[PDB]
Design a protein around this ligand. Structure first.
Ligand SMILES: Cc1cc2nc3c(=O)[nH]c(=O)nc-3n(C[C@H](O)[C@H](O)[C@H](O)COP(=O)(O)OP(=O)(O)OC[C@H]3O[C@@H](n4cnc5c(N)ncnc54)[C@H](O)[C@@H]3O)c2cc1C
Length: 521
């Protein structure tokens, strides 16, 4: 774990704008997307080789509101205009959602909840894992951007309700995703500074790394020979319009780390994708990869909003109610005078005028998947369509009912009694904002309805470029040399209640693997 301090911007000595980058240049590694996974992977690769991260968004400095936790709601409430750190999109489903557009990626705009993955993930996954490295990697991240949270009035009040509700055992303060109520790590220090993955660039090597911002990567270039396809570089546009080239050297590679939506998109626009689909759009086919854009997952978020009669303090989420089929936590916040996008599933949702609390549920997996589709010719700056097919698989919905039933109990416990508006028993007495639970806690066919109408995103989407589908165990795009994907898009199921821990890790992991195979060869 780390000691509270200022956000570390020493990496700016080697961060550039893309208008300030050479029109063409050679590197040992090119990393598209300077996000959650890119930054650590950049840092890692730079220890021993020449590296360039390329990032469509801005320095965090440009938008001072994502350096603190107070700003968390704010970033969401700001209009999307192409420049700002939060990109507003809606699914084919109709559910409002965001993703980051800033150096440090979505770890720069997120809720900052840290958790190490479910150990039982590592074995049933498709990659074979070095567990001395994984664990030692978590150390390296934690030792830098992860902090032990201080008691907070409202959160400890949620710990007690979870333990009263049945969520056992009490694990105390622990980083490991296990079953039971616990108090987990956060990327918000005890002054409320945001520490995100941009700071892991500082863990790099200043003499070897070159970050670039406002570099929208448009195309991955390939080479005919010899004898098979290889990545040679990428093309990116600067803010003026000028396209630049970045090339890989002998023995080098290009690594896409643009997230569930970015990677499938860049690959598809570069003509690695399902043949009949690319033809359909007149995109020249470079390798027929049927599974690119496929198997996109997003865990449904189902919640209850309460408006206590007395005010409650805003909190950063640190207390978690982990059960096998779903995960829970609770957010308290100042009122909303302008709606923060993606918090609620549509913009016409009532806003809270006083302080309120938000009890949420996240189904694991999930099992239901969808698809990335392009709709703009090529324009990388045009957000692709995604469909997630919420509650399409009947098991996701069972776990929703369960989880909502369990929130029903959270509301019944002795801890929540001072937050009811009147002294009515059970779940009644709460002043509800938006859609309330079913009255009868034994009405399956009614809770199923709740789950389906109330659903929003947990923002934890992942998929679209799976190992054992598009990538091999080393994270290579199969049948293409020198091309790799590392990020949210690489696995079909969520690693924990909260994924950034896994992804931050997954970045420096693949780093060391690549570095290793550079010494054993
Ligand atoms: C509102 C919100 C809150 C969240 N809160 C939590 C939390 O509390 N705890 C937790 O564990 N997880 C949380 N998450 C999820 C977690 O932060 C993400 O799943 C994690 O960031 C994984 O992202 P990634 O590394 O795959 O890609 P990202 O971190 O999104 O990185 C992708 C980067 O690549 C860039 N990019 C995209 N396309 C291009 C292009 N073609 N050219 C150049 N650059 C490009 C983007 O600008 C972006 O910066 C939250 C997510 C959201 C949306």
């Amino acid at each position: 774990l780390a000691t509270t301090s200022d956000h570390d911007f020493s990496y700016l000595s080697f961060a550039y704008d893309a208008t300030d980058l050479e029109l063409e240049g050679s590197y040992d590694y090119v990393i598209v997307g300077g996000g959650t996974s890119g930054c650590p992977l950049a840092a890692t690769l730079s220890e021993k080789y020449k590296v360039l991260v390329l990032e469509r968004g801005t320095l965090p400095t440009a938008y001072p509101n994502l350096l603190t936790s107070d700003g968390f709601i704010y970033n969401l409430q700001q209009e999307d205009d192409g420049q700002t750190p939060v990109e507003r999109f809606v699914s084919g489903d109709g559910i409002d959602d965001v993703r980051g557009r800033v150096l440090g990626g979505t770890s720069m705009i997120n809720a900052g909840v840290y958790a190490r993955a479910n150990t039982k993930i590592f074995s049933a996954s498709g990659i074979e894992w070095d567990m001395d490295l994984v664990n030692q990697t978590y150390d390296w991240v934690e030792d830098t951007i992860v902090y032990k949270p201080d008691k907070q009035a409202w959160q400890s009040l949620t710990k007690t309700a979870f333990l009263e509700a049945g969520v056992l055992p009490d694990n105390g303060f622990s980083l490991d995703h296990e079953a039971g109520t616990r108090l987990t790590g956060s990327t918000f220090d005890n002054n409320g500074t945001r520490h995100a993955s941009d700071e892991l660039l500082n863990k790099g090597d200043p003499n070897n790394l070159r970050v670039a911002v406002h570099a929208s990567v448009e195309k991955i270039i390939f080479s005919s020979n010899s004898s098979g396809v290889t990545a040679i570089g990428v093309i990116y546009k600067d803010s003026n319009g000028t396209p630049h080239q970045a090339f890989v050297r002998g023995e080098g590679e290009v690594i896409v780390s643009a997230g569930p939506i970015g990677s499938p998109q860049l690959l598809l626009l570069s003509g690695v994708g399902p043949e009949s689909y690319l033809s359909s759009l007149n995109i020249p086919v470079v390798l027929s990869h049927p599974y690119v854009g496929q198997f996109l997952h997003d865990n449904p978020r189902n919640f209850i909003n309460i408006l206590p009669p007395n005010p409650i303090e805003p909190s950063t989420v640190t207390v978690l109610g982990i059960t096998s089929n779903f995960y829970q936590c609770s957010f308290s916040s100042l009122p909303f005078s302008i709606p923060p996008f993606a918090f609620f599933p549509n913009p016409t949702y009532p806003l809270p005028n006083s302080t309120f609390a938000h009890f949420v549920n996240k189904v694991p997996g999930p099992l239901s998947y969808g698809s990335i589709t392009l709709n703009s010719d090529s324009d990388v700056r045009v957000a692709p369509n995604v469909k997630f097919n919420y509650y399409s698989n009947s098991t996701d919905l069972a776990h929703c009912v369960s989880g909502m039933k369990k929130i029903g109990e959270l509301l019944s416990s002795d801890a929540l009694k001072p937050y009811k508006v009147e002294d009515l028993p059970g779940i009644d007495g709460f002043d509800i904002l938006g859609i309330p639970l079913p009255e009868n806690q034994t009405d399956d066919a009614a809770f199923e309805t709740f789950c389906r109408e109330a659903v929003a995103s947990y923002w934890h989407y992942h998929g679209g470029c799976l190992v054992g589908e598009v990538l091999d165990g080393d994270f290579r795009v199969t049948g293409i040399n020198a091309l790799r994907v590392v990020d949210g898009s690489t696995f079909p199921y969520s690693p924990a209640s909260h994924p950034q821990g896994f992804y931050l890790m997954l970045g420096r992991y693949v780093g060391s693997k690549i570095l290793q195979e550079r010494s054993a060869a």
